Amino acid sequence: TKLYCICKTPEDESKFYIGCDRCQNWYHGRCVGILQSEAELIDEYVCPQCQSTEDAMTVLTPLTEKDYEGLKRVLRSLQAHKMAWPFLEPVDPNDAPDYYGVIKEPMDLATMEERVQRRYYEKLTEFVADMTKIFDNCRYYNPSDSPFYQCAEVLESFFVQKLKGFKA
């Protein structure tokens, strides 16, 4: 006799169970929020804890071939965005001296494209960090009511949605 589910109880044949394909434990459908009628519609089942781990590890796993191609498509979508104009290329040292006096880790979409090309990134978190740097640098350097700051707000919102469901 083994103990199963998050509730740690022995098997009761009068209750509905669903098996997790990742950890191989069994769960009462009632304890994990899934009814028999709903279970019929899914091929594999991943329990809540295993799913939380899978969701969290998406940004830490190795970037695959397909991931890299996907990153290129994500960059292309941002590059075509109306609010991406301040972030397409590095700030021109000649248009703006003190920009580089205070930003030592600048970032832009063209530089990110180069980094994706040469596979500088090896985990999604690294790509997301560079993207976030583009927006954080902008918000650090410009007033919140300024067009530059707000473009970062808009594009970051667009970015977050674009990245939904990115990893296989």
């Binding site: 098997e11 044949e13 009068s14 209750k15 509905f16 169970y17 669903i18 098996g19 394909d21 069994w26 459908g29 028999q36 279970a39 019929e40 899914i42 091929d43 594999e44 089942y45």
Partner: peptide, 6 residues
């Protein structure tokens, strides 16, 4: 999915 029902 793998299940156990009555």
């Amino acid at each position: 999915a793998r299940t156990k029902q009555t």
